[PDB]
Ligand code: HEM
């Protein structure tokens with residue numbers, strides 16, 4: 021069992037938010053590398069507005085895809101440009117076509133992949149960057165790839181990321197580790213899209229507790245001082 | 258003329274329960290966890306009802322309904338993880354509350370102690386059936402293991418498990434009826450808590466000395482309303498630290514995966530507040546003996562008044578029994594840790610020794626040690 | 637284009653935990669290849685080496701990314 | 702009496718703030734959720750519809 | 757003293773005590789949210805959408 | 813059970829102060845710290861040893877369990 025290391029993410033800190041430029045670059049990584057085999061059923065285009073894209077940019081990104089739309093007057097199903105309210109396209113009509121396309125393996129939905137793994141984005145980063153040669157004595161069937169971080173160390177996913185696998189709009193070199201960090205930030209947002217709000221609320225709650233708890237403690241002790249300074253005398257006959 | 262607080266029939270009940278109730282002047286912070294429990298209950302009813310405004314118990318939509326609650330419902334992630342970590346806080350407060358009852362001999366209040374045992378069972382059933390509702394991998398397979406445990410029952414085990422399922426396995430009917438029971442049960446818990454307080458107020462609270470405190474009673478309202486408010490604020494602090502800084506600390510990542518009856522998780526554990534029992538049942542090789550031990554580990558709370566062999570009520574003046582009490586708490590911690598672990602060497606022998614030790618403490622060591630303490634005090 | 641991860645991995649491989657684990661791994665590699673038919677496998681040795689290397693790399697990598 | 706009562710006033714003020722937030726959030730969860738605001742809200746478009754055309 | 761004046765003017769009567777609490781709750785919500793938000797956006801400066809939106 | 817009919821008590825005098833005449837945190841540190849230390853020495857050998865035993869048992873079980881997943885040359 022090779023457990024993932026702890027990487028110093030920008031969002032690891034207690035009040036530390038996600039870097040939203042990394043979320044944007046990570047959407048570009050998902051939408052250009054992962055999406056051909058992974059779905060994100062619970063993330064729609066509208067969700068990316070005010071997070072890593074403007075509404076106009078996200079409407080054009082939805083326009084880039086075609087989505088099936090419900091029955092016509094004649095009763096046929098048609099293809100229409102995507103919309104903000106549309107969820108991310110699914111690469112495969114059903115799980116069986118997904119398994120057929122990927123040598124029997126179903127590639128998981130990535131809406132909750134960070135939350136649904138022990139080790140989270142650390143695990144995903146180490147998995148994406150951790151493809152090595154199989155060690156002496158280890159042989160994998162064809163269509164399987166040695167990854168020391170995958171349970172069993174035999175994964176059906178070929179190494180997806182590499183240097184210059186995509187181009188980044190802000191011009192970053194797209195080194196493999198850069199691409200992995202960006203996509204892992206995006207996956208952390210896709211699992212927990214309340215992360216930044218949750219931590220801002222946590223900061224406010226810590227301030228409010230640091231005010232109220234001393235104050236309620238003073239209220240309790242003001243009322244109780246009557247009992248706590250009380251003196252008793254016994255004067256029997 | 259009258260004081261309507263004392264004369265009005267409803268306000269008279271309220272006045273006698275929380276305002277003019279004579280309370281011991283020395284009950285410690287450990288006596289706060291009653292008021293925390295009733296607060297947790299209210300919180301669970303409040304957030305759950307708001308979850309039930311969006312949740313749907315069909316297996317095709319339950320996991321999706323919860324994702325919708327946490328992603329699109331306004332502040333639905335707040336309500337959801339407040340509910341989950343409030344279940345965890347409920348059980349923390351329950352364990353501390355029962356530990357206080359054990360340590361101070363509060364079980365000598367027979368009726369309220371026995372109602373408390375009933376309450377413990379009902380809260381456990383509610384939490385168990387609620388955890389299935391998200392229909393994650395852990396939801397499904399924990400329901401599977403825990404319900405198929407009941408097949409160990411002689412002659413009617415399979416029939417009763419299938420009747421609880423409403424089918425050949427844990428499936429759609431089980432999820433919908435678990436939602437219905439999970440909705441209704443906390444209100445029965447509310448009624449039982451009211452009966453519980455009715456039985457408690459017959460004598461009033463016990464105190465840390467274990468000595469009757471009637472010569473030093475203070476009114477409940479100004480003192481313990483403010484003290485219980487401070488305790489509630491501290492509890493809220495811990496709960497909100499969980500909800501806002503580590504939402505997933507006490508949960509399991511595999512419940513963010515939708516239930517897969519074809520694939521089972523490598524580890525199928527209950528929630529943390531079941532692990533001590535899951536250890537005990539897993540310690541015994543026999544299916545039915547294991548289930549009987551997992552039930553006796555909570556039914557044995559009914560035996561404490563009959564096991565009391567000390568001349569004193571509480572543990573305040575009995576060092577040897579304090580030693581045994583803290584050994585009992587340590588054994589419960591090790592049972593929780595063992596239940597979170599695989600059934601393999603060395604956790605098996607450790608779980609066996611811990612499971613033996615729990616019963617050997619409650620049933621044997623604690624009585625004999627109280628008798629020894631009795632003689633050391635020459636009575 | 638060069639990746640930070642490559643140079644970070646080499647520098648962290650220069651770590652004595654890595655230096656010890658690497659030759660433990662190469663003694664496993666010398667056995668399992670000499671023995672014609674066995675059940676071992678050097679995955680445990682590689683796991684020790686990778687644990688050390690990746691702890692150091694997780695300390696130093698995000699500074700260049 | 703001022704100092705002591707000041708402590709109560711501030712405490713109430715803090716509690717008020719907290720109470721409001723909690724209630725507000727429970728009220729907004731019964732408000733139209735994000736997806737409802739997304740789909741049923743609007744269907745705007747440009748003059749793409751030609752003359753005499755009932756799209 | 758200042759606290760004697762505050763008590764005599766605003767705390768002695770419960771209605772005026774409550775009015776002071778209400779006005780203070782309004783102004784406290786405003787100022788506390790402003791300060792807490794500024795702290796959160798300073799800790800996370802440049803990382804948030806608001807800081808970077810003006811490029812898109 | 814109501815105030816006024818709880819027990820018989822005799823010859824006991826109590827003296828109390830108004831909360832507005834006294835402080836809510838008098839000698840909170842100069843007296844509170846020695847009291848916490850006294851209350852800690854009073855109970856520490858009754859509470860601590862079971863948790864030390866749990867720490868040792870947990871440490872041993874975890875390290876041993878992980879010592880079984882290691883390859884033994886054979
Ligand atoms: C639904 C959960 C429960 C609630 C809401 C609840 C509520 C309360 C409250 C408010 C008190 C008075 C305050 C106090 O002493 O703490 C109390 C006392 C008591 N409860 Fe509970 N309780 C619950 C569960 C239990 C359980 C599980 C037991 C144990 C089996 C139990 C046994 C007792 C006893 C013995 C007392 C009296 C303690 C004493 O005075 O020394 N209760 N309960």
Ligand code: HEM
Nearest residue numbers: 301302305306308309312341344383384387388390391443
């Ligand atoms: C005795 C009090 C209660 C306890 C201990 C309790 C416990 C739980 C737990 C542990 C869960 C699973 C949380 C998770 O997803 O991780 C849950 C889910 C749920 N509970 Fe409850 N519950 C209580 C009361 C209620 C009540 C009264 C309702 C309805 C009015 C309710 C409605 C729900 C709903 C709808 C869910 C599913 C949503 C979700 O998973 O978060 N609960 N409950």
